[PDB]
RNA sequence: AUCGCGAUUACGGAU
RNA sequence: CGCGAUUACGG
RNA sequence: AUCGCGAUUACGGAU
RNA sequence: CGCGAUUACGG
């Protein structure tokens, strides 16, 4: 049994989908990378720790690259023109039951559901208004 | 036209749904709160800023409360036994087109889709394994 | 919901009613004004904020024009001689439920109900006696 | 005549109605409180002052209590869990006619009428949007 | 109603028309940008302020970009060769009627109508003579 | 060409049109005024200069009279209560061709076109909401 | 407050 | 910052 | 005098 | 920390 498996990070129908696969799990930090050039790959890392006596804290990170070709001196390399960085920290008290945690996950999914304020602002280079 | 409207943060069928509604938009920080006692309410805040010459940066925050009743000296008040705090920062270069941003949003939605590694770990008080 | 809508501020039973409509939403401060020059308009603004860790506070301001001997659309100076200013601050502890808040609204409606002391004193250029 | 009379502050249809009565006029501040221990009473105060050469200012305050029984030193005392405070100040120019003042009263009544924006927001622990 | 809607900034007869849409209202500054990377977008901002006891001032800004593709560090980025800036400030007395304001709008529209002096000079990289 | 000619500033469809005609050319600053006393006239001035080595800049100023309750030919004080001031500054990089400039003019026409946000806000004594 | 003040444009300068 | 938090504060 | 300043609310703070 | 980032680094 494992949850350290590959999964679909970006879903575009059943083709053009971005899949990220396990790559490293050193020092309590799980890492997933999409295939092909590491330079143009999507990256996801995750870890958990006892931040304090009563809290556990997750640290999730995602990197979305802008695939491009670099040319210098006639030598072209596969690179990322730039990257978007997502850093999130989730703090959960040790009193949270599995039911409480499921609620916390639904809250995160709802926050980003299509059509809702926040994902709509981001997807349009906008802020709130 | 506005995206500063109320929306469903937690979806439980069509009943028991947690709705969060606009409450304040001071100093570039949009805030949403669920109804009833502010003390037991869900909170969501969001803001955007030009973090540097080439980047814009979103700061999203969510608070999930554990509803409980406090009793002291025979006086009972509606409170939150504790809260989960979600803090996320999304950095996006100014070269990102609307298409690039839509991709960034699909990445975030995919990261948290039911069944995927990360949301499954959280929902089970677990880490990666 | 979306409660930022036009409403009747001064009710004269259909004929001579003063309607006030949304006119600004800068900084989360909602504003409504009558169809007049801003020097002679009825103005209403409302905002909410967490005044402290234990309280939330609504700040409601109203501006009412002096109508007797008024010259519609004219320049009337000094400004202070032709306008009345209402300034309300409602502090509500974060423990107040919707029910508690409904009762608070009723208390305000009762305070200003027709025939009661306060409104009768104001309407007659009087004090309490 | 004398406008210093009792009135019903909170109307719950002649059953559980909070009526408030005259209780003090010391120092030019008219006071009304409900039939309770001074520690659990609803309180209303009003005072008028010639705040300037050409202005008159009414200062009105209402206190809505959340009644409770507290056990202090092993003994039960009637007390208030918390209180909600309404502080309003109305500045009216001395040139205001009686009919000009009636206009101000109607505006305040219309402002808080059931179904209108502001009372709706307050009653729902919400902001205007 | 709500006047914060999208509109066509540059009209090229429904084909290559530059339409601009709401994107931010943080800090009381209404913003509109076109569907482009933030680095190549048309931008329009507007804000109203009570610049004095008896004045209201609208501050409006428009940014027209000259789009281009630039090769930085051997990589292609969507950028703007240069930008044209329009900064306008309109000061209107509070005694201005709605019809007085309509008069101001018509003057501004007449000012820039095709064939009139000013737009003719600007369009021809010329001065008035 | 010679574009320093009389033109219609306020179009009321033939009847009640406000025409503005050349009235001064001192210092290369072109001026146009309506047929009124200078205290009640519509005034337009326009000039161009090389603001810097990289830019040219047009400075356009408009003065519009408050017409409601106006006394034609009378002495109306204070001046600030009876006049609105438009102040436009258009900066254009020296690389802008006539085509680029034509587009810049269209952007200005679109900004003020009837029915769009900005002109509707101004005409209704409002802000953005 | 004003500037036929500047800008890389919600910033800076001068009186 | 896989820094802490009473969560738009603090290191 | 003003504050979308605070409160334990006829008191206190700031400009 | 609505601190910045070349993103498990740094303030």
Coordinates of N, CA and C in Angstrom, one line a residue, chain A residues 1-12 25 30 32 42 44-46 48 55-56 58 60 62 64-66 82-93 95-98 100-114 116-129, chain B residues 1-12 25 30 32 42 44-46 48 55-56 58 60 62 64-66 82-93 95-98 100-114 116-129:
Chain A
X1 N 0.8 -1.2 0.0 CA 0.0 0.0 0.0 C 0.9 1.3 0.0
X2 N 0.5 2.2 -0.9 CA 1.2 3.5 -1.0 C 0.4 4.6 -1.6
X3 N 0.7 5.8 -1.2 CA 0.0 7.0 -1.7 C 1.1 7.8 -2.3
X4 N 2.3 7.2 -2.4 CA 3.5 7.9 -3.0 C 3.5 7.3 -4.4
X5 N 2.5 7.5 -5.2 CA 2.4 7.0 -6.5 C 2.2 8.2 -7.5
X6 N 2.2 7.8 -8.8 CA 2.1 8.9 -9.8 C 0.6 9.3 -9.9
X7 N 0.3 10.5 -10.4 CA -1.1 10.9 -10.5 C -1.1 12.1 -11.5
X8 N -2.4 12.4 -11.9 CA -2.6 13.5 -12.9 C -2.6 14.8 -12.2
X9 N -1.7 15.7 -12.5 CA -1.6 17.0 -11.9 C -2.5 17.9 -12.7
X10 N -2.4 17.9 -14.1 CA -3.2 18.7 -15.0 C -4.0 17.8 -15.8
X11 N -5.3 18.0 -15.8 CA -6.2 17.1 -16.5 C -6.8 17.9 -17.8
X12 N -6.5 17.3 -19.0 CA -6.9 17.9 -20.2 C -7.6 16.8 -21.0
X25 N 12.3 10.8 -2.0 CA 11.6 10.9 -0.7 C 12.7 11.0 0.4
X30 N 8.6 14.3 0.2 CA 8.2 13.5 -1.0 C 8.2 14.4 -2.2
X32 N 7.6 14.7 -6.6 CA 7.0 14.2 -7.8 C 7.5 15.1 -8.9
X42 N 7.3 19.6 -14.3 CA 6.4 20.1 -13.3 C 6.9 19.4 -12.0
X44 N 6.3 18.8 -7.7 CA 5.4 18.8 -6.6 C 6.1 18.2 -5.4
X45 N 6.1 18.8 -4.3 CA 6.8 18.3 -3.1 C 5.8 18.4 -1.9
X46 N 5.9 17.5 -0.9 CA 5.0 17.5 0.2 C 5.7 16.9 1.4
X48 N 5.2 16.6 6.1 CA 4.4 16.9 7.3 C 5.4 16.8 8.5
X55 N 0.0 21.0 17.1 CA -0.2 21.0 15.7 C 0.7 20.2 14.8
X56 N 0.1 19.8 13.7 CA 0.9 19.1 12.7 C 0.8 20.0 11.5
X58 N 1.4 20.6 7.2 CA 1.8 20.1 5.9 C 2.4 21.3 5.1
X60 N 3.0 22.0 1.2 CA 2.9 21.5 -0.2 C 3.5 22.6 -1.1
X62 N 4.2 23.4 -5.5 CA 4.0 23.1 -6.9 C 4.7 24.1 -7.8
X64 N 4.8 25.2 -11.9 CA 4.3 25.1 -13.2 C 5.3 25.8 -14.1
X65 N 5.9 25.1 -15.1 CA 6.9 25.7 -16.0 C 6.2 26.2 -17.3
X66 N 6.9 27.2 -17.9 CA 6.5 27.7 -19.1 C 7.6 27.2 -20.1
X82 N 10.1 30.6 -17.6 CA 9.8 31.0 -16.2 C 8.9 30.0 -15.6
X83 N 8.6 30.2 -14.3 CA 7.8 29.3 -13.5 C 6.9 29.9 -12.5
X84 N 5.8 29.3 -12.3 CA 4.8 29.8 -11.3 C 5.1 29.0 -10.0
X85 N 5.1 29.6 -8.9 CA 5.4 28.8 -7.7 C 4.2 28.9 -6.7
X86 N 3.7 27.7 -6.3 CA 2.6 27.7 -5.3 C 3.2 27.1 -4.0
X87 N 3.1 27.9 -3.0 CA 3.6 27.4 -1.7 C 2.4 27.4 -0.7
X88 N 2.0 26.3 -0.1 CA 0.9 26.3 0.8 C 1.2 25.5 2.1
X89 N 0.8 26.1 3.2 CA 1.0 25.5 4.5 C -0.4 25.2 5.2
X90 N -0.6 24.0 5.6 CA -1.9 23.6 6.2 C -1.6 23.2 7.6
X91 N -2.1 23.9 8.6 CA -1.9 23.6 10.0 C -3.2 22.9 10.6
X92 N -3.0 21.7 11.2 CA -4.2 21.0 11.7 C -3.9 20.5 13.1
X93 N -4.7 20.9 14.1 CA -4.5 20.5 15.5 C -4.6 19.0 15.6
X95 N -6.3 17.3 17.6 CA -7.6 16.9 18.0 C -8.5 16.6 16.9
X96 N -8.1 16.9 15.7 CA -8.9 16.7 14.5 C -9.1 15.2 14.2
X97 N -10.3 14.8 14.0 CA -10.6 13.4 13.7 C -10.5 13.3 12.2
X98 N -10.7 12.1 11.7 CA -10.7 11.9 10.2 C -11.8 12.7 9.6
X100 N -13.0 15.5 10.7 CA -12.6 16.9 10.6 C -11.7 17.2 9.5
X101 N -10.8 16.2 9.2 CA -9.8 16.4 8.1 C -10.5 16.3 6.8
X102 N -11.5 15.5 6.6 CA -12.2 15.4 5.4 C -12.9 16.7 5.1
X103 N -13.3 17.4 6.1 CA -14.0 18.7 6.0 C -13.0 19.7 5.5
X104 N -11.8 19.7 6.0 CA -10.7 20.6 5.7 C -10.4 20.4 4.2
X105 N -10.4 19.2 3.7 CA -10.1 18.9 2.3 C -11.2 19.4 1.4
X106 N -12.5 19.3 1.8 CA -13.6 19.8 1.0 C -13.5 21.3 0.9
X107 N -13.0 21.9 2.0 CA -12.9 23.4 2.0 C -11.9 23.8 1.0
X108 N -10.8 23.1 0.9 CA -9.7 23.4 -0.1 C -10.2 23.2 -1.5
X109 N -11.0 22.1 -1.7 CA -11.5 21.8 -3.1 C -12.5 22.8 -3.5
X110 N -13.3 23.3 -2.5 CA -14.4 24.3 -2.8 C -13.8 25.6 -3.1
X111 N -12.7 26.0 -2.4 CA -12.0 27.2 -2.6 C -11.6 27.4 -4.1
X112 N -11.2 26.3 -4.7 CA -10.7 26.3 -6.1 C -11.6 25.7 -7.1
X113 N -12.9 25.4 -6.8 CA -13.8 24.9 -7.8 C -14.0 25.9 -8.9
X114 N -14.2 25.4 -10.2 CA -14.5 26.3 -11.3 C -15.6 27.2 -11.0
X116 N -15.8 29.7 -8.9 CA -15.8 30.4 -7.7 C -14.8 31.6 -7.8
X117 N -15.0 32.6 -7.0 CA -14.2 33.8 -7.0 C -12.7 33.7 -7.2
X118 N -12.0 33.0 -6.3 CA -10.6 32.9 -6.4 C -10.0 32.2 -7.6
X119 N -10.5 31.1 -8.0 CA -9.9 30.5 -9.2 C -10.2 31.3 -10.4
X120 N -11.3 32.0 -10.4 CA -11.7 32.8 -11.5 C -10.8 34.0 -11.7
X121 N -10.4 34.6 -10.5 CA -9.6 35.8 -10.6 C -8.2 35.4 -11.1
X122 N -7.6 34.3 -10.6 CA -6.3 33.9 -11.0 C -6.3 33.6 -12.5
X123 N -7.3 32.8 -12.9 CA -7.3 32.4 -14.3 C -7.5 33.5 -15.3
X124 N -7.8 34.7 -14.8 CA -8.0 35.9 -15.6 C -7.0 37.0 -15.4
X125 N -5.9 36.7 -14.7 CA -4.9 37.7 -14.4 C -5.5 38.8 -13.6
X126 N -6.6 38.5 -12.9 CA -7.2 39.5 -12.1 C -7.1 39.4 -10.6
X127 N -7.7 40.3 -9.9 CA -7.8 40.3 -8.5 C -9.2 40.3 -8.1
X128 N -9.6 40.7 -6.9 CA -11.0 40.7 -6.5 C -11.6 42.0 -6.9
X129 N -12.9 42.1 -7.2 CA -13.5 43.3 -7.6 C -15.0 43.2 -7.5
Chain B
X1 N -20.8 44.0 -12.6 CA -19.9 42.8 -12.6 C -19.0 42.7 -11.4
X2 N -19.0 41.5 -10.7 CA -18.2 41.3 -9.5 C -17.8 39.8 -9.3
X3 N -16.7 39.6 -8.7 CA -16.3 38.2 -8.4 C -16.2 38.2 -6.9
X4 N -16.5 39.4 -6.3 CA -16.5 39.5 -4.8 C -17.9 39.2 -4.4
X5 N -18.3 38.0 -4.6 CA -19.7 37.5 -4.2 C -19.6 36.3 -3.3
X6 N -20.7 35.9 -2.8 CA -20.7 34.7 -1.9 C -20.5 33.5 -2.7
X7 N -20.1 32.4 -2.1 CA -19.9 31.1 -2.8 C -19.8 30.0 -1.8
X8 N -19.9 28.8 -2.3 CA -19.9 27.6 -1.5 C -18.5 27.1 -1.2
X9 N -18.0 27.2 0.1 CA -16.7 26.8 0.4 C -16.7 25.3 0.7
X10 N -17.7 24.8 1.4 CA -17.8 23.4 1.6 C -19.1 22.9 1.0
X11 N -19.0 21.9 0.2 CA -20.1 21.3 -0.5 C -20.5 19.9 0.1
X12 N -21.7 19.9 0.7 CA -22.2 18.6 1.2 C -23.6 18.4 0.6
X25 N -13.4 44.6 2.4 CA -12.4 44.7 1.3 C -11.5 45.9 1.6
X30 N -9.5 41.2 0.3 CA -10.9 40.8 0.3 C -11.1 39.7 1.3
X32 N -14.1 37.0 3.2 CA -15.4 36.4 3.2 C -15.6 35.6 4.5
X42 N -16.3 30.5 9.3 CA -15.2 30.1 8.3 C -14.8 31.4 7.8
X44 N -12.2 33.4 4.8 CA -11.4 33.3 3.6 C -10.9 34.7 3.2
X45 N -9.6 34.9 3.0 CA -9.2 36.2 2.6 C -8.3 36.0 1.3
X46 N -8.2 37.1 0.5 CA -7.4 37.0 -0.7 C -6.9 38.4 -1.1
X48 N -3.8 40.5 -3.9 CA -2.8 40.3 -5.0 C -1.9 41.6 -5.0
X55 N 6.9 39.8 -11.2 CA 5.9 38.9 -10.6 C 4.8 39.5 -9.8
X56 N 3.6 38.9 -9.9 CA 2.4 39.3 -9.2 C 2.3 38.1 -8.2
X58 N -0.3 36.2 -5.3 CA -1.6 36.1 -4.6 C -1.3 35.5 -3.3
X60 N -3.7 33.7 -0.5 CA -5.0 33.2 -0.1 C -4.9 32.6 1.3
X62 N -7.4 30.5 4.4 CA -8.6 29.9 4.8 C -8.6 29.4 6.3
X64 N -10.7 27.0 9.0 CA -11.8 26.0 9.2 C -11.9 25.9 10.7
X65 N -13.0 26.2 11.3 CA -13.2 26.1 12.7 C -13.8 24.8 13.2
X66 N -13.5 24.5 14.5 CA -14.1 23.3 15.1 C -15.1 23.9 16.0
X82 N -10.9 25.0 18.2 CA -9.6 25.2 17.5 C -9.9 25.5 16.1
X83 N -8.8 25.8 15.3 CA -8.9 26.1 13.9 C -7.8 25.6 13.1
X84 N -8.1 25.2 11.8 CA -7.1 24.8 10.9 C -6.8 26.0 10.0
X85 N -5.5 26.3 9.8 CA -5.1 27.4 9.0 C -4.5 27.0 7.7
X86 N -5.0 27.5 6.6 CA -4.4 27.3 5.3 C -3.8 28.6 4.7
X87 N -2.5 28.6 4.5 CA -1.9 29.8 3.9 C -1.3 29.5 2.6
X88 N -1.7 30.1 1.5 CA -1.0 29.8 0.3 C -0.6 31.0 -0.5
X89 N 0.5 30.9 -1.1 CA 1.1 32.0 -2.0 C 1.3 31.5 -3.4
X90 N 0.8 32.2 -4.3 CA 0.9 31.8 -5.7 C 1.6 32.9 -6.5
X91 N 2.8 32.6 -7.0 CA 3.6 33.6 -7.7 C 3.4 33.4 -9.2
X92 N 3.1 34.4 -10.0 CA 2.9 34.3 -11.4 C 3.6 35.4 -12.2
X93 N 4.5 35.1 -13.0 CA 5.3 36.1 -13.8 C 4.3 36.9 -14.7
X95 N 4.5 37.5 -17.7 CA 4.5 37.1 -19.0 C 3.4 36.0 -19.3
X96 N 2.8 35.6 -18.2 CA 1.7 34.6 -18.3 C 0.5 35.1 -18.9
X97 N 0.0 34.4 -20.0 CA -1.2 34.8 -20.7 C -2.3 34.2 -19.9
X98 N -3.6 34.5 -20.4 CA -4.7 33.9 -19.7 C -4.7 32.4 -19.8
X100 N -2.0 30.5 -19.9 CA -1.0 30.1 -18.9 C -1.6 30.0 -17.5
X101 N -2.4 31.0 -17.2 CA -3.1 31.1 -15.9 C -4.1 30.0 -15.7
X102 N -4.8 29.7 -16.7 CA -5.8 28.6 -16.7 C -5.2 27.3 -16.4
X103 N -4.0 27.1 -16.9 CA -3.2 25.9 -16.7 C -2.8 25.8 -15.2
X104 N -2.4 27.0 -14.7 CA -2.0 27.0 -13.3 C -3.1 26.7 -12.4
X105 N -4.3 27.1 -12.8 CA -5.5 26.7 -11.9 C -5.8 25.3 -12.0
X106 N -5.7 24.7 -13.2 CA -6.0 23.2 -13.3 C -5.0 22.4 -12.5
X107 N -3.8 23.0 -12.4 CA -2.7 22.3 -11.6 C -3.1 22.2 -10.2
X108 N -3.7 23.4 -9.7 CA -4.1 23.4 -8.3 C -5.3 22.5 -8.0
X109 N -6.2 22.5 -9.0 CA -7.4 21.6 -8.8 C -7.0 20.2 -8.9
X110 N -6.1 19.8 -9.7 CA -5.6 18.5 -9.8 C -4.9 18.0 -8.6
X111 N -4.1 18.9 -8.0 CA -3.3 18.6 -6.8 C -4.3 18.1 -5.7
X112 N -5.5 18.7 -5.6 CA -6.4 18.4 -4.6 C -7.6 17.5 -5.0
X113 N -7.6 17.0 -6.2 CA -8.7 16.1 -6.6 C -8.9 14.9 -5.7
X114 N -10.1 14.4 -5.5 CA -10.3 13.3 -4.6 C -9.5 12.1 -5.2
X116 N -6.3 11.6 -5.2 CA -4.9 11.9 -5.4 C -4.1 11.8 -4.1
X117 N -2.8 11.5 -4.2 CA -1.9 11.5 -3.0 C -2.1 12.5 -1.9
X118 N -1.9 13.7 -2.2 CA -2.0 14.8 -1.2 C -3.3 14.9 -0.4
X119 N -4.4 15.0 -1.2 CA -5.7 15.2 -0.4 C -6.0 13.9 0.4
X120 N -5.6 12.8 -0.1 CA -5.8 11.5 0.6 C -5.0 11.4 1.9
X121 N -3.8 12.0 1.9 CA -3.0 11.9 3.1 C -3.6 12.8 4.1
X122 N -3.9 14.0 3.8 CA -4.5 15.0 4.7 C -5.8 14.4 5.3
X123 N -6.7 14.0 4.5 CA -8.0 13.5 4.9 C -7.9 12.3 5.9
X124 N -6.7 11.7 6.0 CA -6.5 10.5 6.8 C -5.5 10.8 7.9
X125 N -5.2 12.0 8.3 CA -4.2 12.3 9.3 C -2.9 11.7 9.0
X126 N -2.6 11.4 7.7 CA -1.4 10.8 7.3 C -0.4 11.7 6.6
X127 N 0.7 11.1 6.2 CA 1.8 11.8 5.5 C 1.9 10.9 4.2
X128 N 3.0 11.0 3.5 CA 3.3 10.2 2.4 C 3.9 8.9 2.8
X129 N 3.7 7.9 2.0 CA 4.2 6.6 2.4 C 4.1 5.6 1.2

